[PDB]
Every structure is written in C-alpha cells, then in structure tokens.
Amino acid sequence: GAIAGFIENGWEGLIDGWYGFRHQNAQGEGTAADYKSTQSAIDQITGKLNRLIEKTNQQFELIDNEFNEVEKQIGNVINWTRDSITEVWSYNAELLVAMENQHTIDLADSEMDKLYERVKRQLRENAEEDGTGCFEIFHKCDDDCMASIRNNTYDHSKYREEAMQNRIQ
Amino acid sequence: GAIAGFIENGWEGLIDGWYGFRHQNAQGEGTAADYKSTQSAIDQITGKLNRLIEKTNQQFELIDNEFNEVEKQIGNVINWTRDSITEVWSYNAELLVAMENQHTIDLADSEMDKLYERVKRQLRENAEEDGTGCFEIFHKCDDDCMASIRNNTYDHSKYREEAMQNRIQ
Amino acid sequence: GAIAGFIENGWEGLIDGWYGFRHQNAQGEGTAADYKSTQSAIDQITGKLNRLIEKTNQQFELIDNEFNEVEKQIGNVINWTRDSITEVWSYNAELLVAMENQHTIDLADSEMDKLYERVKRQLRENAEEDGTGCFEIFHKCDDDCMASIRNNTYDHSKYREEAMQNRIQ
C-alpha cells in the first residue's frame, strides 16, 4: 500500500484539479487538489487561447474569377502569389502551434516543480525526499497536520524536535 | 524588523543592480547588489536588442502611384499583395515580441534561481531556507562574514561545528 | 588530484556519451557515461532535425523569363513580390534557427540538472553538495557502490548510519 508522486506518475484519480496532494497516515490515505497552482496553469493556457482568438480586421476581396477565368499571365501571377503566401501561413501555423505546445507543456512541469519546492520549504528539516515526488515526514502527521501543509499553515517549529530526533536516532 | 527575499518580493531600494543581497546581523541591516548576475542578465537583454536592430539591405521602389492611380486590375492585385504581406509582418512582429518577452522574463527568473542556488551551495550545512528567498544562518556572521558570502569566499568548514550544533541542539 | 563536475566545466575525456559520472575512491578515479540521459537529449535533437527535413509538396513554375524579359510593369510587380516574400522567409529562417538553438541549448542544460537532481535524491542524507556538480559521499564507496549509483540501485538505508555519523561528528 504505497503511494507515489509526479516524478514518473500521473494521477487518474485526481479529477477536481490539475495538481494536488496525496498523503497517507494512521487515519489512512487521502487525495486533495491544490487550487492556486491549478488556476495559475489554467490562466496561462486560456491566456494563449484568447491570444489566438484575436480576429483580424483586414478584409480581402476577389482578384480572380472562378466562373470566367481571367487572362493567363496575370492569372498565373495571382496563383503564384497566393500559393506563396499560403506556404508562409502554413509554415507560421505549423511553427506557432509547435512552439506554443512546447511551452504549454514546459510551464505545466514548472508549476509542478514550484508546488513541490514550496512544500519542501514548508517542511524544513522535518522531512526527507523519497525521490518519487513524495516527502517522508519524520513525525506524527494526522489529517489536521496534513491539511495544515496544503493550506500553507504548517509550523515546522512545532515538530522540529520530534522530527530531527527520528531522522538522526 | 524582518527582511524577505525574492520568493514573492521585489526590492525598490535596490537601485544599483538587478540582483542583490540583503542581510541582517548584530551590525544591522544591509543591502548590496551582485555584479556578475546583473551583468549576465543585461548582456542577454542587450543581445536581443542588437539582434532586432540588424537592418536590412533590401531596397524597394514604387510600383504604384498616389498622384495618378494605375490601372484597376493590376492596381487591385498590388493592393491585395501588399495587404497580404502587411498581415504577415504584423503577425510576425506580434509573435516575435510576445515570444521574446516571455523568454526575457523567464531568463531573468532563471538568473535569480542560479544566484540563490549558488548561495545555498556556499553555506552547505550552516544554514536553512526560510522559504522567502532567505537563508537562516546558524552562526555568528558579522559584516565581514556576510561580505565573504557575496564575493564567494565563504569557507563553510570554518563555521561548520558552531552551525550544526545550533541546528541540532 | 581533484575532480569537478558540470557547474563550470565540460569533460573533453567523456567521449562515449553526452552526460556521465566521474568518481574517485580508494580504487582510484573513473569516468562512465549515462545512457538514459544521453539518449533523451539525442532523441529531442534529432526530433528537431526530422521536423525541419519535412519537405513541401507545393510546386512552383516560371512566371518570368531570364532570356526574353517580360513587360516592365508586370515585371516590376513580380520582382517586388518575390523580393518581399524572400524577405519573409529570410526572416523566418533566421528566427527559426535562433529560436531552436536557444531551446536546444536550454533543454541540454535541463537534462544535466535532472541527472544531478536524480543522483542527489538517491544519496538522500549520505552525501553533501560541493558546489561544483559533485557529491561528497560520507561513507566508503568502492567501485561496486559507485556502480550502484549509476544504475540507480543505491540503497541509502545501507549506509545511512555510517554516513550521518561522519557528517555530524
């Protein structure tokens, strides 16, 4: 009955948030979502969406005719120009999406690290990293204690004696 | 009379550098700028500027006339081509700036982390993170000691006994 | 006879991989490459290459003549359009390469950090960072022990007593 974090593992059970906490104590196992980190990621992603939704005010009209074909020379110049421009936008579209996706994925990983680093800094000297994205807490942490970590009210000074004693001895 | 670091806080008093140190000991509070990290950030930013200042050698001449309007058909082809190209550069400009700004901001945060990680590695086992971007030093650190940290000459072996004794006991 | 890691130092002797391990114990000094991290970097770089090798199916034909020059007005419109489009691709090419190179270099540094962070998490409380990209191991680590670290089979629980005793006393 072991639990593991993000270092190689997603949580298909986490369904009310993007990032979250999963703990196990004497009271049992539990999973909660972190609001702040989840919303930050959603805000940045929707920020990209709004940015790509921005319509253009440039209006274009007909320059050739698909009923009565225009003269050959000017017609071929037109087709050559259109196809050239189509190549450009097709390239831009391909590149834009590819570039955005690389960043969307990276900033998502970044938020995960920030959350992990926040929790590490909270626990101070009362816990050790297990290398799977989890912290081994070297003191008794009931549900209320675990909840104190999620809402950033964990006072490490309270458990420092008990923890450092278990880490060393 | 508490001081805090970068984890949620800029310093409007830091006016001779981008990144810096703020300490408090028995001698009092102090603030100094870090040269190396500041210059690195400035070099990369100006590097972008020089890159966008690079002029073009392509010369363009008139193809229409704003005094005596050219023939309609070739005129509309011209306007259609120009407007199409204007759409492309307007897109490129918008994207370029947006992309650069995202990177400028990110590399600036990166330099901050690098500086913080450098200092953490200097102090070894003689200090603990408070979670605000500050290090709680578990030994006596006068102005000279603080200065030794800024110029990367802090020998942790000198204070290791005194520090680990205060961290544990 | 001191060794140093990546924090300011490449290894011209590492010739069978991109990333690797360099250790020194009683048995002497040694250097080995890490496969997983090296391949990951190579996969992403070749991923870019394949992405830029993707050919186009747009075929273009002649619209002017270099033997018998076309009429001036339509000729100048053509040259103006071509040169305009050439400016666009020249910009795109310049930007694409510059953008890719910045990312290629950054993701390479990222892999280095990930490897370093992995090893740090393996050693748990049995080692300390020296600030040069190396870990000072506070216990006896023969070649077999060093090999156990490279293939991620290092059990920190085995050396925890001996190590924490040397770190504190």
Add this chain to the structure above:
Amino acid sequence: DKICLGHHAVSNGTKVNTLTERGVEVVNATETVERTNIPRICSKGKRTVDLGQCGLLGTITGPPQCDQFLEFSADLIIERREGSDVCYPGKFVNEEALRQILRESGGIDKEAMGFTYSGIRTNGATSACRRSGSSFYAEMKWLLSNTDNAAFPQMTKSYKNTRKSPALIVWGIHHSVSTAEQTKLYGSGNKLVTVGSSNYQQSFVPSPGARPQVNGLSGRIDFHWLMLNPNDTVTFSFNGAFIAPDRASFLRGKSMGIQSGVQVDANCEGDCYHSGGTIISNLPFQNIDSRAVGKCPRYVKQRSLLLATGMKNVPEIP
C-alpha cells in the same frame, strides 16, 4: 506518515506536436484549423442581392434579366454561374476590372445622360433581347441610318458629370456579320467612333465578319467603359455602328461581392464567404477555401493543427 505531490492524468489522451516530439500525448487539446463549413450564405444584417441570371455588368447596360437590378442597392452582392451580362452576343472590355469595381459599389444610381438624335432611328432591337417582343438593352440605344442602306449622318454628343462622384460611362461597338449587313444598317463607307475625355482618347472601329451564331446571331456588340471625373465631359463622335448610352451610373457606396452556388440564409450572421458557403469561426486558420473573402482566418494546407490545452499526459503506474 508521507505526503506526495502529483498531477492529474487520463486514459483518454490526445496527441499533439512540439519542436522536439511528434505525437506527444497531452491531457487536453483543441483544434486551430477550421474545416466546418456552413453551406449557405449568411446574409443577416447585410442587404443582399442574388443576381441569379443577371450578370453583374448587366446591371449597367440592362438586358431583360437585369431589369430589377438597374438601380440596385446592397451590402452583399452575389454572382451566380448562370448569370449573363448580355442578351445580344458580346462581351465587355476590361470586364474583370469593372466587376471588381461594382462588387464594392454598394449598388448603382442611374442618371439620364440626355442625348437627343435628329436624322436617324434609335429603335434598334433584336430577338435575343426579348421583352414581350423584340427589344434591346434598357440603358442603351441601338442607332441606325433611317431606312436601309441609307447614309448615317456624322454626329457629336456630349455629357458632363455634374456630380461630386465619378460617373460610369458605357458604350458599345456593333460588329455586323458582313459589310453587307453593316451597310444595310448604317450605310456604306468606313465607320469610325471616337470617344474623348480629359484623360481618355481611345478610338474604335467596327470589325464586320462571319462568326459563330450565338443564340442564332453572328453579330457582336462589345461594350467599353470609362470613369468620368466630376465636372469633366465625354464626347461621342460617330457615323454608325455605335451603341449609345441613355443613362450613366454612380456608385452608391460600399459593399462586398462574392461568387457562390449555394442558397442565401437571412438568419445566420457571417463575414467570411466562399463559393461553397460561409465560414463562421473564431479559429485562427482554415482549410476550406484559399480564395475565401471578407474577414476570414488565414488559409493553410493542413487540415488539422492541435493546440495543447493541458499538460503532458503521463499514465499512472499500475
């Protein structure tokens, strides 16, 4: 006691592309390239004319098919393939330039040019332009000699644009099937028609000759046009084979013209059109038609470009 940090994941992953990978699964993605087309012309909010059989250029000269469009007005103008500019066989010179002008004219206002004629006939009509009986272009006058083979007197009619906008002037040159027919209509001798403005000097001559019968006729009436600057004057000197105008045209304002083969819809509201319908989309790109007009997303070759709207999808270790 242990607390673990994690991120969500699904078994319903969707593959996208990055700079490095191709087919990397993310939690959630959305489409950027529109392919969903509305096979109608969304005309809500815009005054719309479905010319149908009336060719756009026909609105100026006025064949029977365009009688209801002689002074039309619209925000959106729709050309149909079955449309025709002519009744009597012929074509416009600089036809496409003129079309592009009328597509954004907002319609046309017609004004009498006030030409009067002396020793000739003006009742030139034909079976090809039927209107109850044999007729002609509603805006034009087919001039003849008076009886048959009779001499056509030299003339010189002029018209001034007394309005603050340029006037669209159109006239025609008739090309008889034979010099025999040209003589029967306008009398013997070489006919000449010269058109003079203050920045226009073109000259014209009939080219009688045998041609394939279009609608039973081998004759050709081909139209020419110029824009008359405000306060400027046009002058028509001629001695036959001349299709004179009765009214000039003035552009109403602003509009947009399209070619289409699908029905009009007055309840849907669109702004980007193609021959196959309307593209209503907030997506930045589209893969429907490269020649789409109005305010449209950029056209691209690709049918699909997925934008990641979620993190990388990493399956839970079972």
Add this chain to the structure above:
Amino acid sequence: DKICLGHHAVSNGTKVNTLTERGVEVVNATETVERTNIPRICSKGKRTVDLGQCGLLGTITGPPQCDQFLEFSADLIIERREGSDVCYPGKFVNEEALRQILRESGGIDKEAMGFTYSGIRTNGATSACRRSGSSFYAEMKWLLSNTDNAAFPQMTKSYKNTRKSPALIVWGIHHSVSTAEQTKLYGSGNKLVTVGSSNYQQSFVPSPGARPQVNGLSGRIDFHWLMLNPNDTVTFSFNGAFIAPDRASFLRGKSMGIQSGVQVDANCEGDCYHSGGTIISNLPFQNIDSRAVGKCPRYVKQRSLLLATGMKNVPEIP
C-alpha cells in the same frame, strides 16, 4: 543572522505582452514600432532633383516646365503633384512603366537622332507650349505639310543606337479636333505611322474627333516609347500626324524616385522615404506608411509593440 537574495523593482512599471499574459508589468521596456516621422526629405549625401512642375516623363519630351531637366542627373528624384508631363494636351502610353524606369535611371543623357526633312514644315507650335511666344516640345518636331491642306509626302527616317546602352525613343501621334483640321495640317487621305525595330512592330493611326478643351485645345498628342537595343535601328514611315523626336535618351545609372509633398532637407541623412517625409529609425517595424520606399523597417498595422528590456516587476510587500 540572515541573508536574503532579491531582485530590484519599481513603482514605475510598464505593461508588455507575452504568450500567456497581456499587460504583465516589467521593470523596463522599449518600443519596436516607429511612429516618429520627419516631415522633410533628408537629401544629405544624395544628389537630389525637385522636379516641381516638371513631370518626370516631361524630361524626355521637354515641355517648358522641364527645360532645366532635359539632361538632369540625380541619386534621388522627387515628383510633385503639381508636376505635368505635357504642354499640349495628351498622355503617354505605358506611362507608369516608363516612370518606374526613369526613377532609377540616375538621370538622362540626350543625343541628337539626326533627322532631316525635305518638302515639309517642322515649325509646328502652339499657345499651350509658350516659351516667350508660341512653341513646342523642346525635344520633338511637330511636322506639317507646307502651306495648308497641302499633300504631306510619305517619309522614312531611321536612327541607329551606336552606344553600349539601350536608347529611349519617344514619338507622338497627333489627334486633331476634326478631319478638317487634320486635312488643314497634313492634307487629305488616311494617315498612317508605322514604327519598326528588331523586336517591335507597332502601328499607329490618328483619331480625329471632338474632345473637351484642355487649356483651350481639343487636340491630343499622345506619346509612345520603346527601348532601342545597342547597334539596333528604329525606322519611322509616315505621311502626317506624326510628332517626330529630335533627340534620344540614355540612362545615366542608378537612382531612386519618390513622390512627396514636403520640403527637401540637405542636412539630414535618410534612406527610407514616403510622401510625408523621411523615416530615420533603427527600429525593426514602422506604422507610418505602407508604401514607404528605400531601405525601411517592415510596415505593421500596430502602432506600438513594447519589448521588455527588464525583468518582471513585482512590487515590494509593504
């Protein structure tokens, strides 16, 4: 004892845009889109001609307004709206193509074509081209019959380009107000002018007819041109209604032509021009004029695009 790591910040933040955010404050930013215009033509370093009333095409035919420009030389050529190519009413055929050629010619060198005439007059002059008294285009010869209604002899003059550069050849066709006036000038009968080269075969005919009076004249002289390849020859066969050239033109080298309505400045140094002045800028983009010419930043729709030159601005916790 405690040491804190930090970064600077200001209360004077400026908002920029990123991929994710819109209006994120940074410490410092700079503009990338130029909007600052110099309402003059910076001509320092470049030899500049302000044609003024002289139309660019006028430098070849030579109305009175262009007498000081018959063999001009420049690096920068400036067209003015009040400019005119003609004295006697008329226009060039392929005018814009010819303009584009002369705008980068670096000026023109004129050479006598050496035509001599026998049984005619060459002193055709008019009130529209006044120069002290009635005159004509300085580079052309208005040919007549000899007395009035007299017969104009058929002729055939030729000229060879003995230079290593193409020669600009210009001639004119006169369109009289009436066949009466055409007869008065060149005698009766149908007039024909044919121009022959080794890759040019055009033919020409006068189109006498009544036209609006420009400067009191209803007559029209319209000019035509071709480029004569080195060592090649042009041949002019005609019997009246022909405006013969006296001199040919040779392009001096390289230049740039612009249209403008603002004064010239010889102390400022520029390289990008528009009708409203000069854009001097190291900025990559500009929002001043899309039709700007020379070496210019790219034109964009946006008036402003701020580039962050500082980190994100995070206010200090008070």
Add this chain to the structure above:
Amino acid sequence: DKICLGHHAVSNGTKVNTLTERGVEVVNATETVERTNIPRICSKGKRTVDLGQCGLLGTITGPPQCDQFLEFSADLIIERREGSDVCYPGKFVNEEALRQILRESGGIDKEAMGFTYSGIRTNGATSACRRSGSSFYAEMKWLLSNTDNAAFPQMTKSYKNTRKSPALIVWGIHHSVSTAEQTKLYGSGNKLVTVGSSNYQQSFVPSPGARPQVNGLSGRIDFHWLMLNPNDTVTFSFNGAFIAPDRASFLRGKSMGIQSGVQVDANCEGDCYHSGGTIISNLPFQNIDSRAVGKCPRYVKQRSLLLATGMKNVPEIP
C-alpha cells in the same frame, strides 16, 4: 569518496546564434541553408526534351529548327537561350502567357484543321525558312493572290473543335516592307482579317512599312493565338496578308518547363531546377537561385544558418 556529474565538451567547437548570443559555441552543428549545386539537369525518371535551337512557341508553328518537336511529349521541358520561335522575322502576341501554357502541357498533339482554298496560291515560301530549298512554317500556309498584283478573293474558313479538350489555334498577319510589296502579294486595297469565336472577336490589319532587315528581310509575320473551347468554332474572314494554320494543337497533359544553360543528366534524379542546374537537398532553405522551380527549399538571403545539434561547449578547466 566523491562522485561528480558532468557533460562532454570539445576543443573543436562551432559557433551558432541564439536569441541572446551571437557566436555561442556548441559541440555540434549542421547547416540548414543549401549552397551545393549540381551543374546539370537531373532528368532520371522524367521524359525530357532539350529544345535547343527550337523555341517553345516554334513547336506550334513549326520552323525548320522545331521539325522534330511538332508533336513532342515530355515531363520536363528545357528551353535554351539559342532557341528561336521563328524563321521568317516576327514574334508572338501574348508570347509569355503562351509559353507558360506549353511548359506544363506535357507536349502537343497536332490535328489537321482541314482548310481548302480555291482561287489563290498557298505555296508562299522564303529563304529565311530554308528546308532543302526555300520553304515556310510547317504548320502554316502563306497565302498569296495567284500571279502578282492580282486580286485576292474574300474568304471565310471555319474549324470546329470536336474534342473534349481546348484547341490551340494560331494564325499570322504579314507586314510587308512596302504597300508595293503588299500589293504584289495580295493585290491593291486595304486588307482586313477578322477572327471570330464564341468569346473572342479580335480584328487585324497589316501594317506595311520599312523596318530593319532581320536575316535580310524587312517583312514581319506576327502570330496570334486563342484557345478553342470544345465543340466551339473559329472563323477566318480575310482578303490577304493572312498566315493560315494547317493544324491545331492539343495539350497532352502535365509537365514542367525550365530555362537552363547546362547539360542534361539522365542518371541523377532531381525535382528542383534553376538555370544553373539542379538543387538536390533535404535542407529547408537554399541560397542558390531565387527563381528556382519545381519542388524546392525556400530561398533566403543568408548563405549559412547553423542549427545546433549539440549542447553548449564549455571547455574543461585545465
């Protein structure tokens, strides 16, 4: 005991560019801009014609140089500078549009138009089109009067395209050196040639006049062309100075035409061509020729753009 993490490096570093730095050394880099050119025309897999002295338009009218190309077929068409469309001095009208059509025609199929003539000669020949002796365009017929100065009867020949593809129709107008020579060939009086279709009405007139001697001749035969829609008909009414066609042309399918000055190679396989050879490359860009055709990488101004294929190169501390 100590373990160190590191990355490799070299003393053989190559400089590349990023957003921030210019000349940052990386371990390994590759080129993205192609500059390596193959000075041949790689024709393996494609049926190739090297027209040589035969001008592309010559394949339709048929001067002696193009006799082996009258019904050619190809996937790749190569024009050479020494190529010529004519034997008797002259040129095509809309020549370039016609070239662009034939470059992707896949070749031409010729069909007899079946014209027969009564009271005239059809054996018009010249020294300029030598074929054993004096001859003419293989696909055309030079029509004359019958004896000399004799009257040329008015005629009217027609041809219908009974095929599912458009027919390329070409005819010529002869411009004699003098009205004396025009009279000698086709008799006195003003000659007229009218060409009628169901969407084409052009008229033509000879322009006799003295011109420079090309290959010893001052006469000019200039060709005109139209595309004949399926089931449609063309009609030729004329009384002299008319170069009649004997056969019509039908496009075979699909091809690509290029202009080049380098040899053909049938063992190498290419798809992007320019006048100087073939660009075979997987690189996204090229700096060889902007006017390169086929399926090619994008052209750029830069000769080199290095893409980093390795990490940053940091030298080992010695």
